[PDB]
Amino acid sequence: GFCCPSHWSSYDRYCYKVFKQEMTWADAEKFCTQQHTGSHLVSFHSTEEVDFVVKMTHQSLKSTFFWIGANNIWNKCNWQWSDGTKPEYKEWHEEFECLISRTFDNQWLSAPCSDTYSFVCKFEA
Amino acid sequence: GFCCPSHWSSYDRYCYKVFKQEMTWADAEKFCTQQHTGSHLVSFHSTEEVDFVVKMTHQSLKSTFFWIGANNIWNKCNWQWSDGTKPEYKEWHEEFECLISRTFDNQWLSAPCSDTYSFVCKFEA
Amino acid sequence: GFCCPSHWSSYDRYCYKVFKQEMTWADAEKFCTQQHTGSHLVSFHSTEEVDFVVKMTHQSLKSTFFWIGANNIWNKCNWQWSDGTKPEYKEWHEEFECLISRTFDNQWLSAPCSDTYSFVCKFEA
Amino acid sequence: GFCCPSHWSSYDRYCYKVFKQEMTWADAEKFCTQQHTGSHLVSFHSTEEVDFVVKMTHQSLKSTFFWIGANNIWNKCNWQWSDGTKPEYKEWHEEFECLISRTFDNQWLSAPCSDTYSFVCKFEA
Amino acid sequence: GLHCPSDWYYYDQHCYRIFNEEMNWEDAEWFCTKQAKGAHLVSIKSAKEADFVAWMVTQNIEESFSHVSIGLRVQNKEKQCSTKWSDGSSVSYDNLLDLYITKCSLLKKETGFRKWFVASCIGKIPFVCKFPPQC
Amino acid sequence: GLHCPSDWYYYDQHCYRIFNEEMNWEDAEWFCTKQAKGAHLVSIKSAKEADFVAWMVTQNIEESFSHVSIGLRVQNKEKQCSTKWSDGSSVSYDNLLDLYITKCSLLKKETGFRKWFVASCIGKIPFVCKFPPQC
Amino acid sequence: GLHCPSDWYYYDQHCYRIFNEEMNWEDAEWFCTKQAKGAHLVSIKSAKEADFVAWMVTQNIEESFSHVSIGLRVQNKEKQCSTKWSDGSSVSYDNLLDLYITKCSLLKKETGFRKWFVASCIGKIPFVCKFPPQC
Amino acid sequence: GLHCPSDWYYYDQHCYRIFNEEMNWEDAEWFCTKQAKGAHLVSIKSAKEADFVAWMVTQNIEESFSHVSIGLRVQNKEKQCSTKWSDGSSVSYDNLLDLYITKCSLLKKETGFRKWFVASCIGKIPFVCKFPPQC
């Protein structure tokens, strides 16, 4: 395959890097896009791939939490009143949640998009 | 059927309410639209329905006249000169008439739209 | 037929009037259009009709010349160089000619559109 | 055929003229277009035609170099990296080259479009 | 008396005349029709003709009349001409009183005979006739 | 007690009632359904009805409860509702923890029962019922 | 005498010459035609050629002539070229006098031979000829 | 020596190396090709990679060379690439001298190896090679 640049790590045919500076989701994502062509917050499509990136961040990070690349997880939903109707009128507490990984497990959770975490960038070699 | 809210009265499948404050036609109509979804100056499609709303307003009103929901009754006409022509040129005294009901009869009459009457609101339950 | 208004004269199914005030072609024409619906500087489609309007203006006018309703008689032409070409480039002395009648003959001539003559108005009764 | 105006020279069915004043390519070209309808920096479609115009400019010019009518000769190229790709990203030293003739030979060369040479105008008689 | 009968006035290309006789609109329009070919209650088709008609009526109306019928009338067959109510539903039932049905039209002394007023077709008033004489 | 059962309130055209009993969202919605024809967890369809519901809950909630279920719920079958990752690839694998799946909704005492908050469907809280009485 | 006959002037790519002989427009244009292949009354196709022609005529016209025919002429067969009257009706009858039919064109001394003037085709004046010599 | 051979530099995902040997463009490009799978004269595909290449060349070029071939070349088969003359006619004949045909490209010491310059393909200069190592 192609090789990853210095200071990034390879797994399958992608390149990954931990960044320690803590940023909002949106900032982490944008910053990822400026480290390298093709680059974004990491996304995951296998257990094996979460384990790889969890090992990498555990070995390098002091916080235990890091952004991965999915935003607004509950804004995006099709919400519906149980009487079967769709809410024309709304008064939602405004909230934005974003996906987060942990460094001691494969499992994910969320945080407000506005909070501040270390993150992992990824792109196809 | 559905029920009418408190302080409005039911007949057939509609909800009615007398309002005493005196307003222009246009104002009465707009105000009706803000009391309830679906609401407007009353309209009538039966004798039985005029009688109901006349009883209701007689029992509650001190004026004898109230707006119902039709405007501009003579502006809307197709007027024509008896020599068969349509008036290109016009000099009408400007006038706007609006339908009005009485509280001691089923019969209607009109008033200038700019005058000031008590009115009845109506909507489908 | 229909009759002509007071102070205008009839011939065939039209109404004619002499006006003495002296105006440019364009002004005469515009003024004609404001005397009556349908009205314009006279136009002619028969000898009999020129004779009628010449009698009328002779009997009433002191100048011998009056505008009739055709303008720009040489601007409108298809002009062409004898070598067969059409003038892209031009330097015409600017000139506007307009048709004029005489009160002692049926024949017409022209004058600059900017000059000042008495004129005849005409419209269909 | 048609004849060339005074002070221009004929060959085949065209008219040519040397101008001594020294101008940029773009200026020479524009100036050519104002000497005569149809006029531009000379172009050449035969050896015989270069020889004619070289004789004419040799006999009349003191510089040895003159603009002929082709610009931007390397901007116009389809350039490609040897790995087969087309340069999205570029950092070309900006350069504009224009064709030039010599007065002691048929052969051409180039110069920056911004430099300053005597030139030859040409048009179809 | 050149283009119009006696007591008619000639203006632009029509003859006119106010009749000081009290009649409802359709009796008036029929009466006009009997006066001459093409006659009708007046029609008023520009500011200059409104001017001429108001003057003429000013000068010939009997002092104790002050309304004059003209020839404009509603064509609609319904009682009044709103076909919809403000809630969007249709006017298919209608209990408007004859007294308030005002489908004819008139001029008023109190305004120099100059604007047009809606009126009951059953009122009995003077009226103006109009027709085009022939040449 | 005219349009609603005892302990229900009548507002605009529906009956309402907070049950001070702790239940998860679907047990609550099923419980509501058993109270009357067409009943469900509340739905709140305008600012005036949000107002009325917040007042009602303020006045009847037991002092030691402070969250109330309402009837809005996510329909999507996936764990959370982003179907794409920011690199454009699709969310086809997903390891989000049950604890962080918040597909139901609720009102909070600490905000006057006025905005709507996402919540876990497995929490056990009081809830409001709504239904339309018949006439 | 290189591209043109004696007494002709060479300018841009054509030969020219004013004839001081009095002729009407078509006799002039036919006379021009007899002088050489492709000759005609002058045509003047830009400001530079108007300039050259005015100079040439200034320098060769006989002192007692002051009008010169050029080659522009109306093609229309009607007397004058308005096909409509201002009321929209068509000009199908037309009693304009020959004297006022001005379908030819000319240059005037009193303006430096520089603008073009409409003229009667029957006037007898000097004229300029133009043709393209061959090489 | 991890991803590239000895004397090659590793940058982003490719190996590079300036050869201080004098060669014309196509001999250079063929020489590059023989060094490794997919190798070619350098291509420079962003400002960061221009930066890295200029530094590398600054640090390894022999002091008496100052031009370096890169991999951009004109594809057109004609002598130069104007296909039209300014009068609109086509360039179908063309007597431009080999010496002035500049269809290759190069970097210059006198500008920090940073912009790209057109050059004769027949000059003999040092050159930079580029290839992607495998993992």
Kindly tell me the burial class for residue F43, based on how many C-beta atoms sit within 10 Å of its own C-beta (0-12, 13-18, 19 or more): buried
What residue ranges in chain H does DSSP mark as E strands?
A: 9-11, 14-23, 40-41, 67-70, 72-74, 104-108, 117-119, 125-131
Residue E6 tokens, joined:
């006696």
For every residue of G30-94, DSSP letters joined together read HHHHHHSTT-EE----SHHHHHHHHHHHHHHS-TT--EEEESEEE--SSSSS--B-TTS-B----
CB contact (8 A) between residue G73 and residue C80: yes
Interface mutation target, options C27, C44, C77, chain G, most CBs of G under 10 Å:
C77
Tally of CB atoms within 10 A around G104:
26
The rounded distance, in Å, linking the Cα atoms of F4 and E110 is: 63
Interface mutation target, options C81, C88, C107, C108, chain G, most CBs of G under 10 Å:
C81
CB H103 within 8 A of CB D82: no
The rounded distance, in Å, linking the Cα atoms of G105 and G126 is: 12
CB A89 within 8 A of CB F45: yes
How far, in Å, are A17, B1, B4, B116, F10 from residue B18 at the CA level?
A: 72, 22, 14, 15, 21
Residue of C nearest to E14 (CA): C3
CB contact (8 A) between residue G12 and residue D2: no
The rounded distance, in Å, linking the Cα atoms of B110 and B102 is: 10
Side-chain-side CA neighbours of B50 within 13 Å: the count stands at 21
Alpha helices per DSSP H over chain E: 25-35, 47-60
Residue of F nearest to A100 (CA): F96
Residue C69 tokens, joined:
């309703």
Residue E23 tokens, joined:
């009649």
As a whole number of angstroms, the longest Cα–Cα distance in chain A is: 57
Query: ∠ at Cα G15 (G11, G20), nearest 5°?
Result: 110
Residue of F nearest to A50 (CA): F95
The rounded distance, in Å, linking the Cα atoms of B63 and D54 is: 110
Residue of D nearest to G48 (CA): D36
Please tell me the distance in Å from B38's CA to the nearest CA on chain F: 13
Q: Is any Cβ of chain C less than 8 angstroms from the Cβ of E115?
A: no
Structural domain total, chain E: 1
Q: With contacts defined as CB-CB under 8 Å, which chain A residues touch H3?
A: 3
Residue B26 tokens, joined:
């246009």
How far, in Å, are A49, A61, E40, F85, F90 from residue F94 at the CA level?
A: 12, 23, 88, 11, 10
CB C120 within 8 A of CB C19: yes
In this complex, how many residue pairs, one in chain A and one in chain F, have their CB atoms less than 8 Å apart?
126
Classify the C-alpha dihedral D53-D55-D61-D63 as positive or negative: positive
For every residue of D57-104, DSSP letters joined together read HHTT-SSSEEE-S---TTTSS-EEETTS---SS--BPP--EEEEEESS
Q: What one-character DSSP code corresponds to residue C1? A: -
The rounded distance, in Å, linking the Cα atoms of D61 and D58 is: 6
The rounded distance, in Å, linking the Cα atoms of F67 and G47 is: 92
Q: Between residues 9 and 68 of chain F, which touch chain A (CB distance below 8 Å)?
A: 29, 32, 38, 40-41, 43-47, 50
Residue of D nearest to H119 (CA): D74
Spatial CA neighbour of B65 closest among B33, B39, B104, B26: B104
CB G15 within 8 A of CB G7: no
Helix (H, G, I), strand (E, B) or coil at G110: helix
Q: With contacts defined as CB-CB under 8 Å, which chain E residues touch B83?
A: 38, 40, 43, 71, 130
Q: Name the residue among H10, H11, H13 with its Cβ closest to that of A2.
A: H13
For residue E17, which phi and psi values (nearest 5 degrees)? -170, 130
The residue segments making up the domain with residue G129 are: 1-135
For residue F2, which phi and psi values (nearest 5 degrees)? -70, -50
CB contact (8 A) between residue G134 and residue D4: no
Would residue B55 be called left, alpha or beta, if left means φ above 0 and alpha means ψ between -120 and 50 degrees? alpha
Q: With contacts defined as CB-CB under 8 Å, which chain G residues touch D5?
A: 11-13
Nearest-Å Rg of the Cα atoms of chain H is 17
Helix (H, G, I), strand (E, B) or coil at H115: coil
The rounded distance, in Å, linking the Cα atoms of B68 and B19 is: 12
How was this structure determined? It was done by: X-ray
Q: Name the residue among E10, E11, E132 with its Cβ closest to that of C2.
A: E132
Q: Name the residue among C1, C4, C5 with its Cβ closest to that of E134.
A: C1
CB H114 within 8 A of CB H50: yes
Tally of CB atoms within 10 A around E10:
17
Q: Name the residue among B41, B45, B73 with its Cβ closest to that of E80.
A: B73
Helix (H, G, I), strand (E, B) or coil at A50: helix
Q: With contacts defined as CB-CB under 8 Å, which chain C residues touch G116?
A: 90-93
The rounded distance, in Å, linking the Cα atoms of D68 and D54 is: 11
The rounded distance, in Å, linking the Cα atoms of A91 and A101 is: 30
Domain spanning C1-125: which superfamily? Answer: Mannose-Binding Protein A, subunit A (3.10.100.10)
Indicate the domain borders of chain D.
1-125
The rounded distance, in Å, linking the Cα atoms of E101 and E97 is: 7
Q: Which amino acid is at G85?
A: W
The rounded distance, in Å, linking the Cα atoms of H1 and H56 is: 16
Q: Which amino acid is at H72?
A: L
In this complex, how many residue pairs, one in chain D and one in chain H, have their CB atoms less than 8 Å apart?
126
Q: With contacts defined as CB-CB under 8 Å, which chain B residues touch F3?
A: 3
Q: With contacts defined as CB-CB under 8 Å, which chain A residues touch H52?
A: none
Classify the C-alpha dihedral F25-F28-F33-F34 as positive or negative: positive
Which distant-in-sequence residues (6+ apart) come within 8 Å of C27 by Cβ? none
The rounded distance, in Å, linking the Cα atoms of D77 and D81 is: 13
For every residue of C66-88, DSSP letters joined together read EE-S---TTTSS-EEETTS---S
Kindly tell me the burial class for residue H113, based on how many C-beta atoms sit within 10 Å of its own C-beta (0-12, 13-18, 19 or more): buried
How far, in Å, are G86, G87, G88, G122 from residue C13 at the CA level?
A: 18, 15, 17, 40
The rounded distance, in Å, linking the Cα atoms of A2 and F100 is: 38
The rounded distance, in Å, linking the Cα atoms of D25 and E55 is: 83
Residue D43 tokens, joined:
């172009």
Q: For residue A79, how far is the Cα from the chain centroid?
A: 24
Q: For residue E92, how far is the Cα from the chain centroid?
A: 30
Please tell me the distance in Å from A24's CA to the nearest CA on chain F: 14
Spatial CA neighbour of H46 closest among A32, D90, A123: D90
Please tell me the distance in Å from F133's CA to the nearest CA on chain A: 15
Neighbours of chain G (3+ CB pairs under 8 A): C, D
Please tell me the distance in Å from F132's CA to the nearest CA on chain B: 7
CB contact (8 A) between residue D1 and residue G135: yes
CB contact (8 A) between residue A80 and residue F97: no
Helix (H, G, I), strand (E, B) or coil at C97: strand
Please tell me the distance in Å from H45's CA to the nearest CA on chain D: 5
The rounded distance, in Å, linking the Cα atoms of E37 and E15 is: 11
Side-chain-side CA neighbours of G33 within 13 Å: the count stands at 9
Resolution of this deposited model, Å: 2.4
For residue E54, which phi and psi values (nearest 5 degrees)? -70, -45
Q: What one-character DSSP code corresponds to residue G111? A: G
